[PDB]
Write a structure and sequence with these properties.
Belongs to the TRAFAC class TrmE-Era-EngA-EngB-Septin-like GTPase superfamily. FeoB GTPase (TC 9.A.8) family. Probable transporter of a GTP-driven Fe(2+) uptake system. The protein has a six-stranded mixed β-sheet, sandwiched between helices. It is built from eleven helices and six strands. The longest helix has 18 residues. The protein is an alpha/beta fold. The structure holds guanosine-5'-diphosphate, tetrafluoroaluminate ion (ALF), chloride ion, potassium ion and magnesium ion. The site of tetrafluoroaluminate ion (ALF) has 10 residues, from helix 1.
Length: 251
């Protein structure tokens, strides 16, 4: 059964989209942190697709156990599609998560939600330019006005039938070296995600993966060599490459 996962920042409208897609009446509230558990439901206009409502999340190195529920679901390899719910009134902040979702190798479709709010402010966003620079389908949606919801579900269903944010070309060299140290120690689909997180020295990924001391000592040397090349800390290199890529989008 094809599983689509609603992933986005808190209070972006994920459960609101879920209810309209499923006909369910799950808890919707105008404050972050309503949804704390995963909830499933069939797409009413396509009973072959099962969609998953998930708690809000800012980062795949999450800051809360509720956000880690969404992260753990994605890394369980059950999801066939990521329906990235993006708050259009915070494009740049939401897109930080987006870059990490694309890196998971699970195909990403963006629901650019709350577009009615940005219409009231008179601001426009070209979905074609954003889709081109991000490498994923993008559909403007309104859960309040009930617009674009059916379109983003059908395109999310078709991304399961990938181009990654290309970063500093010195960072991509380290990433590919870490990938060859990993070999089959990670799922092929999300190998880039794990390579980057190991470069970030992410505690969760380090504990989750079962790497030999031979693998770790080389990864430590790739990071150290690359840190000296960049004259910058490893964690810092990845964060600024993400934000530099996001700014390149909105230009
Ligand atoms: N104006 C507007 N408000 C929305 C939209 N989608 C959700 N909301 C509101 O945003 C708040 C949070 O919605 P929820 O669906 O609970 O967000 P989640 O935290 O992503 O599950 C609620 O007050 C919803 O009515 C939308 O497209 N437009
Ligand atoms: F903040 Al929520 F569902 F309530 F992401
Ligand atoms: Cl988070
Ligand atoms: K909410
Ligand atoms: Mg919710």
């Amino acid at each position: 059964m094809t599983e689509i996962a609603l992933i986005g920042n808190p209070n972006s409208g994920k459960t609101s989209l879920f209810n309209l897609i499923t006909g369910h009446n799950q808890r919707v509230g105008n404050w972050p942190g309503v949804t704390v558990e995963r909830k499933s439901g069939l797409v009413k206009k396509n009973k072959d697709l099962e969609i998953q409502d998930l708690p809000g999340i800012y980062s795949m190195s999450p800051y809360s156990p509720e956000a880690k529920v969404a992260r753990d679901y994605l890394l369980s390899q059950r999801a066939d599609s990521i329906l990235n719910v993006v708050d259009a009134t915070n494009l740049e902040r939401n897109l930080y998560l987006t870059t990490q979702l694309i890196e998971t190798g699970i195909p990403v479709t963006i629901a650019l939600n709350m577009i009615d709010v940005l219409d009231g402010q008179g601001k426009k966003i070209n979905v074609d330019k954003l889709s081109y620079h991000l490498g994923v389908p993008v559909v403007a949606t309104s859960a309040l006005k009930q617009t674009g919801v059916d379109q983003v579900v059908k395109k999310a269903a078709h991304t399961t039938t990938l181009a990654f944010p290309i970063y500093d070309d010195r960072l991509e060299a380290a990433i590919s070296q870490i990938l060859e140290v990993l070999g089959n120690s990670v799922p092929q689909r999300s190998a880039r995600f794990y390579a980057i997180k190991l470069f970030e020295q992410d505690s969760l990924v380090e504990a989750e993966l079962d790497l030999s001391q031979f693998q770790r000592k080389e990864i430590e040397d790739i990071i150290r060599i690359t840190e000296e090349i960049f004259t910058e800390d490893a964690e810092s290199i990845v964060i600024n490459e993400r934000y530099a890529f996001i700014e390149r989008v909105c230009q």
